[PDB]
Amino acid sequence: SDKNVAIIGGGPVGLTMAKLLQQNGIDVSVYERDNDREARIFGGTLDLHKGSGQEAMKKAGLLQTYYDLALPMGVNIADEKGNILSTKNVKPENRFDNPEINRNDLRAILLNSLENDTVIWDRKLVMLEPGKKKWTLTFENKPSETADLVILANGGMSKVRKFVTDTEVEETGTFNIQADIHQPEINCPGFFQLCNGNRLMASHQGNLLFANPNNNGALHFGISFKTPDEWKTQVDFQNRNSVVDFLLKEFSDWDERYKELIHTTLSFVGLATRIFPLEKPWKSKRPLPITMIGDAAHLMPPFAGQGVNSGLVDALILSDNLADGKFNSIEEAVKNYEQQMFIYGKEAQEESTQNEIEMFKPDFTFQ
Ligand SMILES: Cc1cc2nc3c(=O)[nH]c(=O)nc-3n(C[C@H](O)[C@H](O)[C@H](O)COP(=O)(O)OP(=O)(O)OC[C@H]3O[C@@H](n4cnc5c(N)ncnc54)[C@H](O)[C@@H]3O)c2cc1C
Numbered sequence: 001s002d003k004n005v006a007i008i009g010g011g012p013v014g015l016t017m018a019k020l021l022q023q024n025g026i027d028v029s030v031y032e033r034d035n036d037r038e039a040r041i042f043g044g045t046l047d048l049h050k051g052s053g054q055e056a057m058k059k060a061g062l063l064q065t066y067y068d069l070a071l072p073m074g075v076n077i078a079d080e081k082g083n084i085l086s087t088k089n090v091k092p093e094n095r096f097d098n099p100e101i102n103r104n105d106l107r108a109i110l111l112n113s114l115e116n117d118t119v120i121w122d123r124k125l126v127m128l129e130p131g132k133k134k135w136t137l138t139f140e141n142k143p144s145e146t147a148d149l150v151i152l153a154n155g156g157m158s159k160v161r162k163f164v165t166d167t168e169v170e171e172t173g174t175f176n177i178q179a180d181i182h183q184p185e186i187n188c189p190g191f192f193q194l195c196n197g198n199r200l201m202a203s204h205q206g207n208l209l210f211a212n213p214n215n216n217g218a219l220h221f222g223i224s225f226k227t228p229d230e231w232k233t234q235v236d237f238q239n240r241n242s243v244v245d246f247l248l249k250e251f252s253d254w255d256e257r258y259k260e261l262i263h264t265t266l267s268f269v270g271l272a273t274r275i276f277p278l279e280k281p282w283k284s285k286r287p288l289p290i291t292m293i294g295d296a297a298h299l300m301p302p303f304a305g306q307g308v309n310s311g312l313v314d315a316l317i318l319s320d321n322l323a324d325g326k327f328n329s330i331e332e333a334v335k336n337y338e339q340q341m342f343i344y345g346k347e348a349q350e351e352s353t354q355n356e357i358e359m360f361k362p363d364f365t366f367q
Pocket residue numbers: 008009010011012013014031032033034043044045046047123124125126153154155156176178222271293294295296302305306307308309311
């Protein structure tokens with residue numbers, strides 16, 4: 001292989017691709033939107049499961065490191081008042097496909113395993129264009145670059161897939177509001193104490209709460225519901241007041257301990273749940289070698305655990321396919337990775353869609 005591989009986007013998935021290819025002596029750059037490595041990453045914590053994510057980390061020789069930094073959480077399920085089922089983590093079961101790792105910590109682990117200057121920061125891919133033997137890649141206000149194989153790994157909202165497929169992101173019907181409380185021990189003490197160093201989830205009449213009281217000392221929480229008829233949007237995530245107003249109304253029946261969790265949030269993030277659905281087969285005729293992995297390839301609703309792990313397998317199976325050297329052409333290696341990922345991906349989205357229907361039914365319980 002006289003060639004080089006341009007990975008667009010250094011997510012947890014993208015950076016794993018980079019690592020798995022780099023250890024096999026392949027030329028690779030990671031082109032990342034973010035301004036620099038220290039950029040804060042919003043979101044809850046990721047956890048790598050024993051069969052999938054953990055297995056890719058293992059192959060990058062990074063499991064022990066991920067274990068070091070990850071923190072196993074128990075789980076409390078509560079009503080709109082007090083505790084219904086506690087699930088502390090059993091000692092022989094702690095490394096078990098749970099260790100909750102902070103999204104920045106995981107990037108810090110991945111980046112560290114890569115050779116210096118593998119990732120190029122302040123690189124926003126806005127355009128893609130097939131040349132003679134090379135993809136010319138266009139980055140907003142930066143010098144453009146060229147690669148032999150583009151791997152799209154830029155998340156659920158990738159604007160740059162036309163060369164692989166015509167399908168487009170869909171809204172699934174649900175919606176998520178998310179925030180971080182800092183010093184949750186004094187800022188939302190009642191709620192802090194409900195969690196009792198465990199993760200917490202509660203559901204009441206089509207609203208779901210999920211909180212993790214120790215994401216590197218910040219309480220992160222998400223509230224989730226069916227997207228209201230009114231919208232299609234009519235709450236403004238700029239004014240914290242409209243969000244507060246709306247949340248307090250929806251959470252009227254809930255305990256003071258949760259309401260205090262809304263009042264204290266300085267700012268909220270809104271998001272419609274989306275799916276990049278694995279319905280059609282992707283494009284056959286492809287001018288030069290291009291493929292997609294992680295959320296770019298199969299964005300799917302979060303609610304049932306799924307997300308990064310499928311995207312981490314995508315890295316495991318593609319790197320092997322491009323490295324173990326079984327196929328006669330890059331073009332075969334991709335097609336083979338894709339044949340497989342369509343199987344376990346659809347399997348997953350299906351389970352995901354399902355659980356999303358199941359839990360936003362007006363009568364759901366985690367029981
Ligand atoms: C509320 C919520 C809760 C979730 N909970 C979980 C969970 O508990 N477990 C789980 O597995 N998943 C969860 N998910 C899904 C999970 O976050 C994703 O599967 C995972 O983060 C996707 O990783 P990725 O590397 O494939 O894409 P991403 O992590 O989104 O990374 C995309 C990278 O691409 C870069 N990028 C974007 N645009 C460009 C561009 N134009 N040019 C260059 N780079 C670009 C971005 O800068 C970013 O660094 C949740 C999602 C939501 C919304």
